[PDB]
Amino acid sequence: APLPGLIYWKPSTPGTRHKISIDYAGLGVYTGPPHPELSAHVAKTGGRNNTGRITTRHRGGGAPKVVRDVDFDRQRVDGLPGVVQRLEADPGRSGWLALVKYSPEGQLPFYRYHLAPADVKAGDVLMSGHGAAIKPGNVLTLRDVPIGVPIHNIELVPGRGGQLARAASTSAVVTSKQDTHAVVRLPSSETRLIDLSCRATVGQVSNHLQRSINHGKAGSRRNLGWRPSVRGIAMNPIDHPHGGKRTRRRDASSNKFIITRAG
Amino acid sequence: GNRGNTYQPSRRKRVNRHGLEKRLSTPQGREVLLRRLRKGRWRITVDSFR
RNA sequence: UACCGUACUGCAAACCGACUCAGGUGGGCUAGUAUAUAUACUCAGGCCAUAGAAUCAACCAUGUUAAAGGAACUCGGCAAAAUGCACGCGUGACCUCGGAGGAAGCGUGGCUAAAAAGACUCAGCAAAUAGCCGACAGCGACUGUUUACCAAAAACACAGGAUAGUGCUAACAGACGUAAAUUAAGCUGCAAAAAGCGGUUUUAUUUUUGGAUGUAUACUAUCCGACGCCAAACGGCGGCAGUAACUCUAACUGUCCUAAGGUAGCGAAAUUCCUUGACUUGUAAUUGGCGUCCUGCAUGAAUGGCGGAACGACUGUCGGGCUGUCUCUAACAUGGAAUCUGUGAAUUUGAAAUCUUCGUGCAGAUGCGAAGGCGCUGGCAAGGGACGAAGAGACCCUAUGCAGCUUCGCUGG
RNA sequence: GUUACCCUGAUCAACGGACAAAAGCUACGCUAGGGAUAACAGGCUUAUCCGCCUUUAGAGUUCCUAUCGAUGGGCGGGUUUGGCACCUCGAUGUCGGAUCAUCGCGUCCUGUGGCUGAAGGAGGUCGCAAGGGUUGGAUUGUUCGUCCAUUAAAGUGGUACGUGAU
RNA sequence: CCGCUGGGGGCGAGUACGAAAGGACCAGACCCCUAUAAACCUCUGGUACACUUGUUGUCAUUUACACGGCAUAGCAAGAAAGC
Ligand SMILES: [Mg+2]
Ligand SMILES: [Mg+2]
Ligand SMILES: [Mg+2]
Ligand SMILES: [Mg+2]
Ligand SMILES: [Mg+2]
Ligand SMILES: [Mg+2]
Ligand SMILES: [Mg+2]
Ligand SMILES: [Mg+2]
Ligand SMILES: [Mg+2]
Ligand SMILES: [Mg+2]
Ligand SMILES: [Mg+2]
Ligand SMILES: [Mg+2]
Ligand SMILES: [Mg+2]
Ligand SMILES: [Mg+2]
Ligand SMILES: [Mg+2]
Ligand SMILES: [Mg+2]
Ligand SMILES: [Mg+2]
Ligand SMILES: [Mg+2]
Ligand SMILES: [Mg+2]
Ligand SMILES: [Mg+2]
Ligand SMILES: [Mg+2]
Ligand SMILES: [Mg+2]
Ligand SMILES: [Mg+2]
Ligand SMILES: [Mg+2]
Structure with missing residues (x-):
């Protein structure tokens, strides 16, 4: 079933054989770099904390990280007509943003x-x-x-x-x-x-x-900043013991607000 | 692969590792310098000159 | 308009390798035939110093040529040889329709011609550079990564999928003895002759580790590894003894401990003891493959079962061509070796003036016994012996021995 | 509470009875030793093996000895499988063939003599003789083995089941 | 003291024998082969790198006549001695 906004890559070579990518004609106005004062250029981390050792694994490399100042409260733009100028596609989030221009009187x-x-x-x-x-x-x-x-x-x-x-x-x-x-x-x-x-x-x-997107090769997901994983049973017992437990903090203060759990 | 050539010389790295200021920056580096003094070494650090 | 650099070397005899070490070392500039920084000859420029001198040793290394054969050699065509190029024709199965594919296979090439053509040469991709091809399987979808110094692979990863956790100051992984510093606004309050110090709420700047300036279509962990066709937690999935008009299977019934006795679809298979499994082909002759069959010592949907295109310095086999791998070696070329001159080590070494055979013997004698042999000393060769030399650890055993790892071994907050 | 006496309580059974308690792995291994303990083989033995007999009952259309040996009894070799642990762990190539060898004879052929149920041929033994000859390769990691087809034949052994300072 | 003299098939014999098919001891000598060993280059071939011929690219060449360098002896063909 061909969805309209997906680029269906032809099976010309292995790697682009089973690759599906999002068309930027469905999002026609993505074109343009991030806005020069709504964005900065922060260094990538690689998964290492302030100590310098790896805390989150299988991360690192890829395109230069650019961060965007997304307003998630909209507290100071209340009662203000904001016309959406264009839609932008950020790699740091699954969903895409929308540029909005507010013109106040004073x-x-x-x-x-x-x-x-x-x-x-x-x-x-x-x-x-x-x-x-x-x-x-x-x-x-x-x-x-x-x-x-x-x-x-x-x-x-x-x-x-x-x-x-x-x-x-x-x-x-x-x-x-x-x-x-x-x-x-x-x-x-x-x-x-x-x-x-x-x-x-x-x-x-x-x-x-x-959901329908498909990186057809290891490189296209590696270039997003995802270093390869290694299975547990592929090691010696010192590195991992290879070769059903609820892990939420019990007695927390947020048990009062939830009626049913994640079903 | 032939070994033996682990020493790749560089003045920036030599002064930045074994220089006076990285020795003085930490306490145990300062006791390293203090026991170099107590031994009686003529050259205290790799970057000393006059 | 000060201060520092400016010599020399810089693919190397001056850097990193103990060396004047065949190794490693970044960027830039460049002429012609000519056309690409490839290839042959050359420009500018540079070089022919670091062992020399002749000659036919054997033998070693690296190559050239070889009559008739041609994998007959060998664990194995390993190694060599062979195709190697631009213009035309052409061009299979299988297939994810992209590929296989440069499939396979056959013509046409230099030189002269202001030009319809020709010359002769054994030879016209004329010297140098530029894929061997086809078929049957096994394993892994693919490109990649992997043990620096004996393993590059079927091992790892991979896109994708499944499961489990995570409602955000998230889980998970770390630092730990606990997070707070400076203003501002508001509401205030105390005795009081016209002013001071406070309490509380909100806000501003910091300071508040990755995940994340993210948030269940997201993040983390585990497993299978594309795609296609029909308890996905550790991990398996039995026996007893009989029942179908000639022998022999046990389909349905009869039993015993028992979580349960292994489906359509698999099997002498990466894995099946009998073994040269009977069966066809394969060769003249086949224990190693291919396709069937059943008697599964010790197979099998998440230890993922069933095969496929393309891919592989992966593994086992068949044809064509090719040739010294071979029958069976020969001649030649270059460089060692051998001769001379000059420079000039090391392994080893109880002392030696060190014969053979048989016997004896800590049980394989140069040294002891019996008999015999031997003018003496070397160069160049071959290595049977000196239980040659090189490591006080190849394997086995032992220690009040160590070390790391594992667990329903023991004890600990 | 202290001390004596009279007594009791472990399959403390590892029974002269470890300090409380108490399992494994190492082809990743490390150290110190041992030829005081095994494997690759040299030494001793000959139970099992292989030759020589002897008794030879019998088979052999008859008849023990052309030819075979049933049962017992022995002699010789250590090349079979074993037994011992005497030699080397201050580590020592064997279980293959490629080349090149030397020796023994229990002779496959070539050279030969006897008995022959000996038509000469073609055979079976038995006696002497080790001069030199024993080739192909297809299949298996196989020294084991076949079966392709040729020869007069496609020998069996000692050789640390010869031979990596080739 | 070393090496040391290998065989097979014919002719002998269609045979002595033998109802008959079926075919020898003798190697005694001659003819062929094949080993092994020892030589030799006369023949036949191979090779032959200061030999002869042809040719490509390029650098030299006041003639792009001849000659010369390099490209595995550049390549290809044919050679005599020696082996
Ligand atoms: Mg390199
Ligand atoms: Mg060093
Ligand atoms: Mg270099
Ligand atoms: Mg060195
Ligand atoms: Mg150098
Ligand atoms: Mg040149
Ligand atoms: Mg010189
Ligand atoms: Mg020929
Ligand atoms: Mg050419
Ligand atoms: Mg590729
Ligand atoms: Mg690859
Ligand atoms: Mg969930
Ligand atoms: Mg020389
Ligand atoms: Mg002796
Ligand atoms: Mg001599
Ligand atoms: Mg000598
Ligand atoms: Mg002990
Ligand atoms: Mg005890
Ligand atoms: Mg104890
Ligand atoms: Mg023994
Ligand atoms: Mg002549
Ligand atoms: Mg000549
Ligand atoms: Mg020149
Ligand atoms: Mg010669």
């Missing part, structure tokens, strides 16, 4: 990066507040969003920004409205109670094609 116009919902066309105007619309890309309080409409970029403690349901093609659903709790189904089929003063970016995150 200040010169500026640009901000926010996560892109499914209904951004590089022409839409986004609005955030108590009185905002129900069209996708609006940030509303959990009280102002309906029951059963998909939402994303959810906060846990108000004023912190959006931390929940923000990967590619993911969304959360509000199913109940307890006065201070508001039971919400997180994308792992887990119900969590999120305070009503928290905010939800209404809509659904883009990059649904993320």
Whole structure:
């Protein structure tokens, strides 16, 4: 079944034989480097902490890391009409961002990066507040969003920004409205109670094609900063003992907010 | 592969490893210098000159 | 308009290798035939100092040629030989439709011709450079990575898939004796003749390790390793003794301990003792392959079962061509070796003036016994002996022996 | 509580009875020794093996001796499989063939004599004789073995089951 | 003191024998082969690098006549002595 926005690489040689890549014609305005003041150039880490030893394994190498200042709260852009100039594709996240230009009355116009919902066309105007619309890309309080409409970029403690349901093609659903709790189904089929003063970016995150993508060769996934793994049974007993246990911290403070676990 | 040529000379690396200031930067390097003094060595570090 | 560098060397006799060491060492510039920094000859420029001198030793290394054969050699065509190039024709199966493929196989080439053609040569890709081809399997999808100094592979990885954990100050991996420093705004409060010090909430700047300026389509761990066709936690999946009109299988029933006795689809197979498994082909002759069959010592969907295109300095086999690998070696070339001159080590060494045979003997005698032999000393060769030399550790045993690893060995917070 | 006496309590069975408790692996191994302990083989032996007999009952269309040897009894070799651990662990090429050898005869041929159930041929033994001859390669890592087809024949052994300072 | 004299098939014999097919002892000598050993280059071949012929590229060549260098002796063919 050919999806429209995927480049189906022809089997010319092994490696590009079973390779599927996302077309940048579906996202027509990705073209352009990251904005020169919304982005910096930070050194890559390689998986090593401040000591210098490896903490996370199988990481390192690849393209120069560029970091983008994505605004996950939209607190200081409340009540401001922001017209989306273009959509951008960052390699650091599964879902892609959306460049938004805000023109306030007393200040010169500026640009901000926010996560892109499914209904951004590089022409839409986004609005955030108590009185905002129900069209996708609006940030509303959990009280102002309906029951059963998909939402994303959810906060846990108000004023912190959006931390929940923000990967590619993911969304959360509000199913109940307890006065201070508001039971919400997180994308792992887990119900969590999120305070009503928290905010939800209404809509659904883009990059649904993320599941259908296929790096056909080791190099294309190695060039993303992923060094090769090694199986446990391929070693001597000193390195690994080769050749069903729940690991969440029990007696935590967040047991009170969850009704069912990740199903 | 023929061995024996592990010493690849470089003045920057020689001064940056075994120079005076990396010896003084850490406490145990300072006791290394102190026991070089107590032995009586004429050359204290690899980069000393006059 | 100061200070430091400026010699020389820098693919090397001046750097790194104990050496004047056949090794390792970064960047840049460049002429013609000519056309590519490849190839042959040459420009600018550089070099022919670090052992020399003749000659036919044997033998060794590296090559050239070889009549008639041609893998007959050999564990194994190992090693050599052979194809090696641009213009035309052409061009199989199988297949993931891309490939296989430069498939295979056959013509046409220099030289002269202001030119419809020709000359002669044994030879016209004329000297140097530029794939051996085809078929049957096994293993691994592929390109890659791997034991610096005996193993480059079927081992590892790989894209993909499955499972388990992780709701964010996430899990997981680390530092550990515990995180706080400076302002600002608001609400305030105490006695009080017109002002000081406070308490609390919010905010600003720092400081707050990777994962991550990420967040269940994301991160971590384990396993299988593409793709296609029909308890995916450790890991297996039995016996007793009989029942089908001639012998012989045991399909359905009868039994015993027992988590359960191994499906369509597999099998003398990387793995099957009998073994040269009966069966066909293969060769004149086959214990090592290919395709069947069943009698699975000791096979088999996640130790992943069933085969496929392409790929491989992987493994076992068959044809064509090719040739000294061979029948069976010969001549020649270069460089050692042998002669002379000059420079000039080391392994080894109880002392030696060190014969043979038979016997004896700490059990294989140069040295003891009996008999015999031997003018003396060398060069150049061959290595049977001197239990040649080179390591007080190849293997076995022992230690109040060590070391690392493993576990339903013991004890510990 | 201290001390004596009268007594009791381990399959402390590793039974003169380790310090509380208590399993393995090392083809990754390390050290110190041992020819005081094994393997590659030299020494001793000859149970098993191989030759020579002897008794020879019998078979052999008859008849023990053309030819074979059933049962017992021995003599010789150490090239079979074994037994001992005497020699070297201050580590010493064997279980192969490629080249090149030397010796013995229990002779496969060539040279030969007897008995022949001896038509000469073609055979079976038996007696002498070791001069020199014993070739191909296809298959197996095989010194084992066949079977392709040729010769007069396609010998068996000692050779640290000859031979890596070739 | 060393080496040391190998054989096979014919002719002898279609035979003495033998109903008959089936075919010898003698190697005694002659003819062929084949080893092994010892030589020799007369024949036949191989090789032959200061020999002869032909030819390609390139550098020299006040003639791109002849001659010369290098490219495995550049290549290819044919040679005499010696082996
Ligand atoms: Mg190298
Ligand atoms: Mg050194
Ligand atoms: Mg060099
Ligand atoms: Mg050296
Ligand atoms: Mg050098
Ligand atoms: Mg030149
Ligand atoms: Mg010289
Ligand atoms: Mg010929
Ligand atoms: Mg050519
Ligand atoms: Mg490649
Ligand atoms: Mg490869
Ligand atoms: Mg999950
Ligand atoms: Mg010479
Ligand atoms: Mg003796
Ligand atoms: Mg002499
Ligand atoms: Mg000598
Ligand atoms: Mg002990
Ligand atoms: Mg005891
Ligand atoms: Mg104890
Ligand atoms: Mg023995
Ligand atoms: Mg002549
Ligand atoms: Mg001549
Ligand atoms: Mg020249
Ligand atoms: Mg000669």
